[PDB]
Amino acid sequence: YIQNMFQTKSFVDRYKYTEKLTGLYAQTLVDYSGVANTSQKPLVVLDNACGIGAVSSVLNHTLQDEAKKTWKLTCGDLSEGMLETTKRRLQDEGWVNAETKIVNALDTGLPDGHYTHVFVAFGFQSFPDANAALKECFRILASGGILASSTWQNFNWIPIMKAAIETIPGNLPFPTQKEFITLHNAGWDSESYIQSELEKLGFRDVKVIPVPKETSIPIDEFFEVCMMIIPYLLPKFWTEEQRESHEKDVPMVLRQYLQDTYGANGQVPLEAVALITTGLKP
Ligand SMILES: Nc1ncnc2c1ncn2[C@@H]1O[C@H](CSCC[C@H](N)C(=O)O)[C@@H](O)[C@H]1O
Structure with missing residues (x-):
């Protein structure tokens, strides 16, 4: 009877706000992959x-019409709710030769040596076991195929949430950005770790590039990002008594902190570094 966070309607519904953060790197990942000017055809x-389709959307806007005539795009995710949203986007944006499909990154069910490109945009730090997913990526790539991934190294949004939580009486705990980033898998926030892991599997020409981004988003959109994330952290970081005393106050505390800090009509400055990784399957 246990739920997976990513399958819950409330999570999926707020993810469009969170995609303003992951989406900072969708163009980066597509462009760095070389998919727009490759020899592979x-x-x-x-x-x-794929989430709600960040990379797929960029692909459909970036690739030549001639390339889309002959390609096949599979938008894979474990979450049925994520794919339902992606399906609507696929229709609305008019993606060509594209399909959604349930794909478990740890056990894809997809054929050996099938894909010219596999994109994993902010997946590896969310999977139960990143390295098992990476082995699947290697398996399903054709000879000459490219893996392109984005993973987080640093970001300011967890620290902003922490600062808000620190305005509640009781000295309540909250993760550091590093603790949050490595909740499921360590290493994917380190260039050297990633280089070594891909090379160990047999990927070649491995490149891992840290890319800084800064933007801003309205406080009301940022509130939704916080509300998506914080409820899943509290059972891990707070006691039962702390949750009984303070969990119901988190939304008010967040609103007040954001208004007080950035202004009632303000913008929250988002700052991140992601690792953009590419590797070739020989
Ligand atoms: N085992 C698994 N297999 C496939 N997808 C998984 C998974 N575990 C989690 N996910 C998916 O990993 C995604 C992480 S969020 C990143 C979504 C998107 N690529 C973007 O850049 O916005 C979610 O859509 C989640 O449902």
């Missing part, structure tokens, strides 16, 4: 852990 592409 036709293209056979997997957007693995």
